[PDB]
Design a protein around this ligand. Structure first.
Ligand SMILES: [Mg+2]
Ligand SMILES: [Zn+2]
Lengths: 52, 71, 196, 153, 190
RNA sequence: CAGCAGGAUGGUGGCCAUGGAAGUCGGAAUCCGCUAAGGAGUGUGUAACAACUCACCUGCCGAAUCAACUAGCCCUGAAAA
């Protein structure tokens, strides 16, 4: 039902991110500070929860 | 182990109010003596180790302690 | 770390100024990890290894510019990494005999081809597959009773022509390799002399 | 037809599921008789998967034993092996005899992939630390324990 | 602090002759001309040499906030030369699991209808930017190739059909659909 | 100091070990021996390896990194009829 390469292509734009602990935004995976202002460029970051 | 006491006290700073500072002394242990001076004086037998502390010997007391230190 | 063998060359510098007056000045391309290998039995006592870094490629050689002092011209010579694998005995047959133990490659997209590539007259040893790799590039391959055989001796890369990427599957399906990989000896330097 | 084949036989341990069908099987000779006589030709290892070489000839396949030095380390270290139970914290240890440094040499000279009896004092320590034993400290302590204070040729 | 001088230069190959009147540059060559005006940045563009073989840009008396403007014009100029000599070709695939994605081009390369996305009968009348000529690929099952010269008109219109087709109210770790972008490339090759 | 870069295991396929694992699985351990290069692997892969890259090291150019003072202003912190 699906090719695991095009699927590797669609994990990149949706499921490899880094999330702030304060404003729940979605950052590019190699990032250290949030690009927003309503959290103050906070350095609390997590990975996005992988599928169960 | 010096780079884990700044980290322990950086956390202890979140229970007290106000503002306080972390300072590394220039002494040796829980004494009132300096850093380098301590081993040349113990070596010339002016100070005596007593567990957590140390006693100071002057040149003032009577002589029989001196003889009980050298002999 | 980055402090530990940094100070031990400028003690072990001179151990080879005064000993070994003869080098084969080899030019460093594709010194591999799988293809410098099946060689041992020509080179037993004619050779050495020791350090070398570009960071003192200057400093300790100018510190050495003083014993036999006509000693400058190597630096416009090595345009890259060129290792001076020493030798001791022969004048001409170690310039020669490093030719007889090398083992070639899998047909790879990624090397350079300076000379002619030949493709043999041989079957592939397989069944009904896709002939578009032979019939779009210009090679006569036809289905031959299950097997696929190279019909005519079609050459791919002639003398001094670059390697195309999608033209490796014919020799890879034959498991037969164009030329012998390994390491190339480049220059000569003997006792105040140079060649080209 | 001469085909020296690599097999990983389980030595003196008669195996349950061996690795003989995708390697020797499609030739025509049966590897079921040989897997037992090879463990018989091993005998007193019984623990160790010393790899046994087999050379397929036109008549049959022969048996050859390939000696080591790190399995002569397991010869110098004679511990009880374990059964099928296969429980962790297994890594053996002990004391290697200084004349077993001599005698592991006198069987790692047929291979001869090293230097002589005084050039034997690394082989029984620096892989012996990954198999599990030390002669009074690892190779770093047996630096000053072995540097030029010996009496062994 | 105040840094006194910072500059950067660009070499130009000789299939292209460039000039500038004031601050807006024009670059013409094999595929057409492009003009881009830099009148909000306040730098000095100098064009040294007979035959005009390279360019140089300066900025006197600038802080950290405007030493950034030395390189990010050299980039929009190397992109100005590439979009005239070579020209851009964005290739983008089309992931679908169960329903068929239908893709149809209206207006000879200047409009895209999209049908049958997640079973939605709602067609998406996506318009391009003037400058970009789309196409269905060849020698591939599902693929679009967008072609053009200006990269700014190419990539934004490429991301439009990437954001036109999204997923409402559900997972996007499981519902992975859409026309995604695969490879950024040029028309012809050096 | 970033990367348009040439590649990482002939003893062994560790010991006892997983049915099959060779580093790609579990365990006291963790080394020095042509070793500019040991890691019984940071890791993918494979029923196992095979095939790969990398911690550490080897090619091309004209000046940087780790914490810590909240040290000054600026912002988030900061909800009314
Ligand atoms: Mg719902
Ligand atoms: Zn945030």
């Amino acid at each position: 039902i699906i090719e695991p390469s095009l699927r590797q292509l669609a994990q990149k734009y949706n499921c490899d991110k880094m999330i702030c602990r304060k404003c729940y935004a979605r950052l590019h995976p190699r990032a250290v500070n949030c690009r927003k202002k309503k959290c103050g460029h906070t350095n609390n970051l997590r990975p996005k929860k992988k599928v169960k | 182990n010096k780079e884990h006491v700044v980290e322990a006290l950086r956390r202890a700073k979140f229970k007290f109010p106000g503002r306080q500072k972390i300072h590394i002394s220039k002494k040796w242990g829980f004494t009132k003596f300096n850093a380098d001076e301590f081993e040349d004086m113990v070596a010339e037998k002016r100070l005596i180790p007593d567990g957590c502390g140390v006693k100071y010997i002057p040149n003032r007391g009577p002589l029989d302690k001196w003889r009980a230190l050298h002999s | 770390d980055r402090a530990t063998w940094k100070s031990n060359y400028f003690l072990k510098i001179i151990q080879l100024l005064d000993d070994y007056p003869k080098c084969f000045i080899v030019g460093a391309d594709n010194v591999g990890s799988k293809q410098m290998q099946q060689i041992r039995m020509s080179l037993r006592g004619k050779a050495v290894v020791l350090m070398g870094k570009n960071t003192m490629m200057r400093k300790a050689i100018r510190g050495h510019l003083e014993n036999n002092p006509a000693l400058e011209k190597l630096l416009p010579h090595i345009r890259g990494n060129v290792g001076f694998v020493f030798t001791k005995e022969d004048l001409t047959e170690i310039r020669d005999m490093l030719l007889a133990n090398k083992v070639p490659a899998a047909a790879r997209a990624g090397a350079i081809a300076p000379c002619e590539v030949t493709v043999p007259a041989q079957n592939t040893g397989l069944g009904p597959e896709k002939t578009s790799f032979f019939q779009a590039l210009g090679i006569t391959t036809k289905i031959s009773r299950g097997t696929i055989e190279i019909l005519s001796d079609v050459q791919l890369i002639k003398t001094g022509d670059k390697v195309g990427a999608s033209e490796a599957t014919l020799l890879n399906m034959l498991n037969i390799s164009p030329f012998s990989f390994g390491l190339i000896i480049q220059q000569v330097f003997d006792n105040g002399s140079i060649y080209n | 037809e001469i085909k020296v084949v690599y097999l990983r036989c389980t030595g003196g341990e008669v195996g349950a599921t061996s690795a003989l069908a995708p390697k020797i099987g499609p030739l025509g000779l049966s590897p079921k008789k040989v897997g037992d006589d090879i463990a018989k030709a091993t005998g007193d290892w019984k623990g160790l998967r010393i790899t046994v070489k087999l050379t397929i000839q036109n008549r049959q396949a022969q048996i050859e034993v390939v000696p080591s030095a790190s399995a002569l380390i397991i010869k110098a270290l004679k511990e009880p092996p374990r059964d099928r139970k296969k429980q962790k914290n297994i890594k053996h240890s002990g004391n290697i005899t200084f004349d077993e440094i001599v005698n592991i040499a006198r069987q790692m000279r047929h291979r001869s992939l090293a230097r002589e009896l005084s050039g034997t004092i690394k082989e029984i320590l620096g892989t012996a630390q990954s198999v599990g034993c030390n002669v009074d400290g690892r190779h770093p302590h047996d630096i000053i324990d072995d540097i030029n204070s010996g009496a062994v040729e | 602090m105040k840094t006194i001088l910072s500059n950067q230069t660009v070499d130009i190959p000789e299939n292209v002759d460039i000039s500038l009147k004031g601050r807006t540059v024009i670059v013409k060559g094999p595929r057409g001309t492009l003009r881009r005006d830099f009148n909000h940045i306040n730098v000095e563009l100098s064009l040294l040499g007979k035959k005009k073989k390279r360019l140089r840009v300066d900025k006197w008396w600038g802080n950290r906030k405007e030493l950034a403007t030395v390189r990010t014009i050299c980039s929009h100029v190397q992109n100005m030369i590439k979009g005239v000599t070579l020209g851009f070709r964005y290739k983008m695939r089309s992931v679908y699991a169960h329903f068929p994605i239908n893709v149809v081009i209206q207006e000879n390369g200047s409009l895209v209808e999209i049908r049958n996305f997640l079973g939605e009968k709602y067609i998406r009348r996506v318009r391009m930017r003037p400058g970009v000529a789309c196409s269905v690929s060849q020698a591939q099952k599902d693929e679009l190739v967008l072609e053009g010269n200006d990269i700014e008109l190419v990539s934004n219109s490429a991301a439009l059909i990437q954001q036109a087709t999204t997923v409402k109210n559900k997972d996007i770790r499981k519902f992975l659909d859409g026309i995604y972008v695969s490879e950024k490339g040029t028309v012809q090759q050096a």
